[PDB]
Amino acid sequence: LGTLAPAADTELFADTLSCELRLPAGFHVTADPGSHATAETLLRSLGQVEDELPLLVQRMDAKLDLILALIGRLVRQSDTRLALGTVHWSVRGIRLASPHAHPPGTTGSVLLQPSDWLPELLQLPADVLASASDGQQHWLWLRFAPLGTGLQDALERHLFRLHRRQIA
Amino acid sequence: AMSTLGTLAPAADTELFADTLSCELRLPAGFHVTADPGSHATAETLLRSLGQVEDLRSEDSSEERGELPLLVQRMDAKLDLILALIGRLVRQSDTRLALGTVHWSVRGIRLASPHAHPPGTTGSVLLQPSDWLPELLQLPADVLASASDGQQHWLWLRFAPLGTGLQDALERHLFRLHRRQIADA
Amino acid sequence: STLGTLAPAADTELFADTLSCELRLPAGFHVTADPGSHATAETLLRSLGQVEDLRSEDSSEERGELPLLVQRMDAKLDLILALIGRLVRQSDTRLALGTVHWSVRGIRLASPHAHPPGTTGSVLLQPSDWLPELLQLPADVLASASDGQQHWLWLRFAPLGTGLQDALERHLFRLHRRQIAD
Amino acid sequence: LGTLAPAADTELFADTLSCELRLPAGFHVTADPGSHATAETLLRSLGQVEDLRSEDSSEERGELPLLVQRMDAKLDLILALIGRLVRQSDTRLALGTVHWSVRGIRLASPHAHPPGTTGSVLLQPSDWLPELLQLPADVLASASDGQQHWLWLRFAPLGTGLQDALERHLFRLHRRQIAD
């Protein structure tokens, strides 16, 4: 129950906020990863819309909400959709389940939906630390490649906020 | 006013429409058993946003060149354009609901349905609130009554609790539609 | 253009004593009971005019305001608008591009089939070439004639209302101005 | 690679910033493309959102009203989402090395074309944005080396604004390149 790859499990979660939650997520092999700016922007933006001025600005915001809602729905109604499941996520890496096992050292990108109303996916380049199967299937232990100052700060804030939300 | 359809399900019609603003109108409406409404906040946001943008204007095209610079008017124009284009995109792929006469209140709705459904059936009422915006309002609901009048199967649906925010937005929406229907009369 | 001699009465009703522009653009008439929306038409026209604006001689960087954040927001809007435009152009049924005669009162355009005077429907046309947004205006056929090659229709827009009418008049005037260049 | 068309390489890259990079690009033989305005809007807008990337991280964190900051966030979300939608059904352009100047571009085409062929150079300027830059161009040289067919496209006059935008874009491209 996690101790089927204790070495990685410790590297990814020891002494750091590690959340256990259900969300669409998966590992995709590729030499073509994503961008840090993009992931940072996505994270901070989700957070900034946490919860006025001249009427024109108030109605501009109403228009924005309508646009986001429409576009949000169009994507969610045609996208492939990632495998929904229980994952263990920290600023260092993620413990999720994938269709097939992978050799440790396999490069790629972890794809996850940080929010469920918004179908925008978070793409984080990562490598496999371990690939042990038993939850009937193959579980992956992915280690994110260095995030950089900004993205890492965003991710910790995201996880911290996500945790308190859950702790209530 | 005074549609005898209520005589098909007296107790249901009373539950949904007695002592509350109940509007009889025509608009794209439907009911589906296999739900997927989303959140109360999405429905609430749609209704409120829709209200802020609709109901004509203050009969003036100015108001912007004053109090506001010009870079912002440009931005507002672009939003109007994007919104219209996104609405155009949607009409391209989405299956539209069929037009029908319905009786709508904050509690539920009475509408015609292709197939009958026994009371107790759970699902979602689908409605296109606007007209210029191809967006659907989905509201989880239960079938209170099901009856026929001879050519159409009628359903009386009671909405699942809407929550403070959405309820408020719907009440405002209904109140608005009402004065407007009476207005252009 | 001598197309007017095919229906003098209709041509006079639509273009006499008012600004009338002869130009090429996608435009069509479709028999329908779609009441369209004055507000939608007015919004499209005024918004279009706002973005078709400036970038004239004070182009490049017409700086006057201050906030840098708002400038970035405006850049984002330009990018969004451009992409959304492309998407719509993917699976949308394009209109027929032909020469037309347009005034605040109605329009003369080519049509697949002729129609009896009094036939009501909607005139559809693409105001700007760089954006796939269409303007819809309820109209009735005044005249219907052929030049031996095509069916020409003279459509009279139903009352536009004060706001839409003003927007359309502004639209046609700028259009006329723009084209009297060189 | 380049001697294949001495005169064409001198006309397009002599005494002017020329960058060597890899990105989706292609030449499409079309009757008439156009719109410098659309091309300039794209480059100028890209640049502004490109600088929004780190470097002081912000001209002023709080600054304007909080409602504004949040509307800006929604914009980021909308752009991302629409970008994702565009990718669901668009056609990617082959990645390739190209030499690009404000005057023209040299790229690898799946076929050759005679000098005078006209159309549009198609480029995807930013990896994060699925938007293509289209610039009317003519072919002034087509030659083949080992395998690939190489084309020398000479942009049709860009006009004051577009030219400025492209020169700025290329300079930023260059500067960022030196930052390896």
Side-chain angles (χ1 to χ4, degrees), chain A, chain B, chain C, chain D residues 1-52 54-180:
Chain A
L1 62 176
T3 184
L4 62 169
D9 205 275
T10 285
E11 178 183 314
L12 260 34
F13 316 113
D15 301 321
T16 190
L17 213 214
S18 299
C19 298
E20 174 95 318
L21 59 172
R22 346 68 169 60
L23 58 55
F27 181 49
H28 164 66
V29 179
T30 23
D32 42 70
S35 174
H36 286 166
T38 303
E40 189 184 352
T41 303
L42 172 57
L43 285 184
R44 294 184 188 294
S45 284
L46 266 53
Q48 202 148 183
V49 309
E50 40 203 358
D51 110 287
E52 267 306 286
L53 306 175
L55 255 185
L56 196 166
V57 177
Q58 299 179 50
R59 289 156 87 143
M60 277 173 63
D61 196 49
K63 296 180 187 181
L64 282 175
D65 291 328
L66 253 7
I67 295 181
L68 187 46
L70 274 275
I71 206 300
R73 172 171 75 69
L74 291 195
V75 176
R76 185 156 54 72
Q77 289 186 172
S78 53
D79 54 3
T80 155
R81 290 308 217 330
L82 259 37
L84 173 63
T86 293
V87 302
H88 205 199
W89 187 18
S90 72
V91 68
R92 304 208 279 263
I94 192 174
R95 197 265 304 302
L96 45 57
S98 69
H100 303 294
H102 287 289
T106 299
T107 299
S109 303
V110 168
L111 299 179
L112 75 185
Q113 200 184 308
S115 297
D116 219 283
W117 72 90
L118 201 60
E120 181 62 18
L121 306 182
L122 173 64
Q123 185 175 187
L124 300 179
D127 280 314
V128 185
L129 290 185
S131 180
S133 164
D134 202 292
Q136 187 44 296
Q137 294 317 307
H138 331 311
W139 287 88
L140 255 46
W141 273 265
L142 299 310
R143 182 62 176 84
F144 306 137
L147 307 172
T149 309
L151 168 42
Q152 186 182 301
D153 179 85
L155 189 54
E156 304 201 85
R157 285 172 186 267
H158 185 66
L159 300 170
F160 180 99
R161 291 156 65 81
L162 179 163
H163 182 287
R164 78 148 83 79
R165 257 55 146 314
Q166 183 185 305
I167 205 61
Chain B
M2 301 176 269
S3 185
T4 60
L5 274 52
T7 57
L8 285 183
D13 215 80
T14 284
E15 183 175 320
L16 299 177
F17 314 116
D19 302 328
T20 50
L21 208 201
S22 293
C23 303
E24 167 81 348
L25 69 161
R26 167 176 295 288
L27 85 170
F31 173 77
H32 273 294
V33 297
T34 307
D36 49 289
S39 67
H40 282 169
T42 300
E44 171 177 22
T45 298
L46 165 61
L47 265 42
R48 291 190 184 297
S49 302
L50 206 50
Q52 300 184 240
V53 179
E54 278 181 354
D55 247 274
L56 176 53
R57 61 171 180 180
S58 182
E59 59 92 18
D60 74 68
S61 179
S62 181
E63 123 74 60
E64 71 186 313
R65 51 181 173 181
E67 177 70 298
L68 187 75
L70 187 63
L71 182 288
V72 181
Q73 307 185 197
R74 162 189 176 79
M75 289 169 66
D76 194 39
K78 300 180 186 191
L79 282 173
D80 286 326
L81 259 10
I82 292 160
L83 214 224
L85 282 169
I86 181 70
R88 180 167 305 281
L89 222 206
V90 172
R91 290 174 195 287
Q92 261 178 37
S93 60
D94 283 7
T95 302
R96 312 88 166 64
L97 298 158
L99 262 172
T101 305
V102 310
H103 210 209
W104 191 15
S105 84
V106 66
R107 299 177 194 144
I109 188 172
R110 175 178 84 218
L111 57 79
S113 199
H115 304 297
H117 282 286
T121 306
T122 293
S124 288
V125 164
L126 276 60
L127 245 47
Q128 185 181 322
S130 176
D131 194 322
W132 60 275
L133 185 69
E135 239 313 291
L136 301 188
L137 178 71
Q138 298 207 178
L139 301 181
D142 286 16
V143 179
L144 292 190
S146 178
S148 170
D149 61 353
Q151 60 182 59
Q152 307 196 72
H153 307 89
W154 293 91
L155 270 21
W156 279 255
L157 299 305
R158 187 228 288 121
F159 305 130
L162 304 155
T164 304
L166 179 54
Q167 188 168 307
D168 185 77
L170 178 55
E171 266 165 36
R172 287 169 182 278
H173 183 73
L174 286 176
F175 190 93
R176 269 226 196 61
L177 288 186
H178 182 288
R179 73 181 177 207
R180 197 158 71 246
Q181 279 173 278
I182 298 303
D184 55 57
Chain C
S1 299
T2 177
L3 291 168
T5 67
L6 280 308
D11 208 80
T12 284
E13 183 178 325
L14 299 180
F15 316 119
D17 295 329
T18 185
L19 215 207
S20 302
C21 303
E22 177 89 324
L23 71 160
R24 281 164 51 65
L25 61 46
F29 174 87
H30 306 285
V31 175
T32 309
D34 198 319
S37 177
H38 282 172
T40 299
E42 185 179 0
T43 302
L44 176 60
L45 257 34
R46 300 187 174 293
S47 299
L48 226 39
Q50 218 132 178
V51 314
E52 301 287 58
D53 219 306
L54 288 181
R55 195 263 156 179
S56 304
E57 189 63 356
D58 198 66
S59 181
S60 59
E61 296 182 357
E62 179 168 358
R63 301 169 279 72
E65 43 56 282
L66 302 173
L68 221 297
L69 173 65
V70 62
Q71 303 207 316
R72 300 297 174 55
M73 284 181 274
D74 180 58
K76 295 181 182 174
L77 286 171
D78 289 332
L79 293 177
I80 291 167
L81 182 58
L83 281 186
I84 189 72
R86 184 190 291 286
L87 281 172
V88 172
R89 259 186 284 101
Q90 267 189 168
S91 307
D92 70 345
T93 55
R94 308 305 216 294
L95 265 44
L97 169 62
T99 63
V100 307
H101 205 212
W102 197 16
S103 81
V104 68
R105 274 125 65 170
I107 190 181
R108 181 188 72 220
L109 51 75
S111 169
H113 330 294
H115 288 293
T119 306
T120 77
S122 292
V123 175
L124 281 294
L125 61 89
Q126 192 185 323
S128 296
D129 53 6
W130 59 290
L131 237 64
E133 193 43 42
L134 301 184
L135 174 83
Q136 180 174 294
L137 297 162
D140 292 0
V141 175
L142 282 194
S144 175
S146 167
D147 58 23
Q149 288 171 44
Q150 335 183 65
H151 291 305
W152 294 97
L153 267 46
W154 273 261
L155 292 331
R156 210 292 168 52
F157 306 130
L160 304 164
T162 307
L164 178 55
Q165 206 187 308
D166 168 85
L168 179 55
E169 275 171 23
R170 288 183 189 267
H171 186 71
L172 297 171
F173 185 103
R174 286 202 296 287
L175 199 47
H176 185 199
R177 215 214 306 99
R178 270 60 149 298
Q179 96 147 279
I180 300 186
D182 290 354
Chain D
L1 182 51
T3 307
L4 300 55
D9 212 276
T10 286
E11 182 178 308
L12 289 189
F13 312 124
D15 304 337
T16 193
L17 182 65
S18 302
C19 311
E20 188 62 290
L21 63 174
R22 309 191 68 264
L23 41 78
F27 173 64
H28 179 58
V29 180
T30 179
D32 308 64
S35 191
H36 286 161
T38 292
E40 170 179 22
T41 297
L42 169 60
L43 289 185
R44 288 182 189 295
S45 299
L46 276 184
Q48 293 187 64
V49 179
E50 237 66 349
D51 301 327
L52 203 187
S54 193
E55 275 53 291
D56 198 1
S57 186
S58 57
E59 178 65 1
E60 181 63 4
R61 40 266 63 180
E63 194 64 292
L64 289 173
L66 180 153
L67 177 68
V68 177
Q69 298 168 288
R70 165 190 263 66
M71 287 167 88
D72 175 60
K74 295 175 187 166
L75 278 176
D76 283 340
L77 294 173
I78 291 150
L79 187 54
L81 284 163
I82 176 175
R84 184 173 300 287
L85 211 180
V86 163
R87 293 177 187 287
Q88 292 186 182
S89 65
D90 77 317
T91 300
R92 311 296 179 176
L93 283 61
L95 276 64
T97 297
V98 297
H99 207 204
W100 190 11
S101 75
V102 64
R103 307 192 295 226
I105 193 171
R106 179 207 70 212
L107 49 72
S109 183
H111 298 303
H113 297 82
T117 304
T118 72
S120 294
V121 164
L122 293 169
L123 260 48
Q124 191 186 326
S126 299
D127 183 290
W128 62 280
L129 187 79
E131 181 60 315
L132 292 304
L133 172 71
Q134 179 175 57
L135 306 173
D138 282 359
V139 190
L140 65 168
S142 178
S144 178
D145 54 359
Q147 265 295 173
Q148 292 253 72
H149 288 292
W150 293 82
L151 298 171
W152 279 254
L153 297 313
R154 191 279 188 78
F155 301 139
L158 303 166
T160 310
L162 177 54
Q163 167 145 47
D164 177 58
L166 180 50
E167 303 183 330
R168 281 168 186 276
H169 181 77
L170 288 176
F171 186 93
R172 287 200 292 284
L173 187 296
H174 184 282
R175 189 167 59 185
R176 301 204 191 75
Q177 188 158 305
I178 302 304
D180 31 29

